[PDB]
Design a protein around this nucleic acid. Structure first.
Lengths: 163, 163
DNA sequence: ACTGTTTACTCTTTAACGTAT
DNA sequence: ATACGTTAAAGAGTAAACAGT
């Protein structure tokens, strides 16, 4: 019950501030850690179009409903650090990871395994600093950990858009 | 059977030309009549992804798969012209319509009922010309008919995205 | 292990709805 | 007849699988 009283207290104060300011906060946290909105909808129980509109535009939503978003934020933000202190969702390419990939697509559109392995760490390190963690805590990215196969399927799908 | 043999002839002639050339034809016909891609993948059985990627990008699909679309295209093309001569889908705003609606939204954000009725004709007219039929045959648009209610829900949902 | 075919999934966009006025 | 609050539906995007060289 100790951390509990803390968590329920944060839900209180977050329920007092402007929805938009506390919404832009939670969305940035989602993007930063590349957390799917489906994970929220699945656990919380709110409609997606409501979430998306609230997180992207500012559509007001009932305080009851909002609370559940804040309870999940506080609980998940606790979980991520625990997942990272120890070194079912689809992998999502991070924006920093995609920068290095498109850059390497200009040098070689068909790189070797070792050429992809070097790309793996440069992306997993760029993700680890987007989260705000040391790159040594890499397996904490979980379902979003970059694998050479994922780098492969990224390069293979990119050759499709050519023609 | 007399038109049937004709329909099978069009399906084969199109099955010989370039996928992309005849794909761009279908989308333009879908965009011209604001026909849901869903209608295709309901009546065909195709995959929306595969479909969407074929009409929007150059992604190929097998001749058997293609053929099903061409039979839908050829039969639906005859069915609409019939609908307009003898004159459950969601309504979709046309681009010629939306041009008028956004234009008057600058003149008045809350138009009178009669002011909306004037807009109704200017749009059904624009949609009919887009589809290439005389506006006297405006009952043929079916689920794409512009009603004053639809104009209202538009203007209402538009002022929503103002804050 | 690479190409091409097809796909399960995710997110946004949107017209309408439903409930209070 | 109308604001908000909320929602069912559509379609694009995407990572991945599956077959089959």
């Amino acid at each position: 019950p100790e951390e509990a009283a803390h968590q329920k207290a944060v839900v209180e104060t977050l329920l007092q501030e402007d929805p938009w300011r506390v919404a832009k906060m939670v969305k940035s946290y989602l993007q930063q850690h590349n957390i799917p909105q489906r994970e929220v909808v699945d656990t919380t129980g709110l409609n997606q179009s409501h979430l998306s509109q609230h997180l992207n535009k500012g559509t007001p939503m009932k305080t009851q409903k909002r609370a559940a978003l804040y309870t999940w934020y506080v609980r998940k933000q606790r979980e991520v650090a625990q997942q990272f202190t120890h070194a079912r969702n689809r992998f999502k390419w991070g924006p920093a990871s995609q920068q290095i990939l498109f850059q390497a697509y200009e040098r070689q559109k068909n790189p070797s395994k070792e050429e992809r392995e070097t790309l793996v760490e440069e992306c997993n390190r760029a993700e680890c600093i987007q989260r705000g963690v040391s790159p040594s805590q890499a397996q904490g990215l979980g379902s979003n950990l970059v694998t050479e196969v994922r780098v492969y399927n990224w390069f293979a799908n990119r050759r499709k858009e050519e023609a």
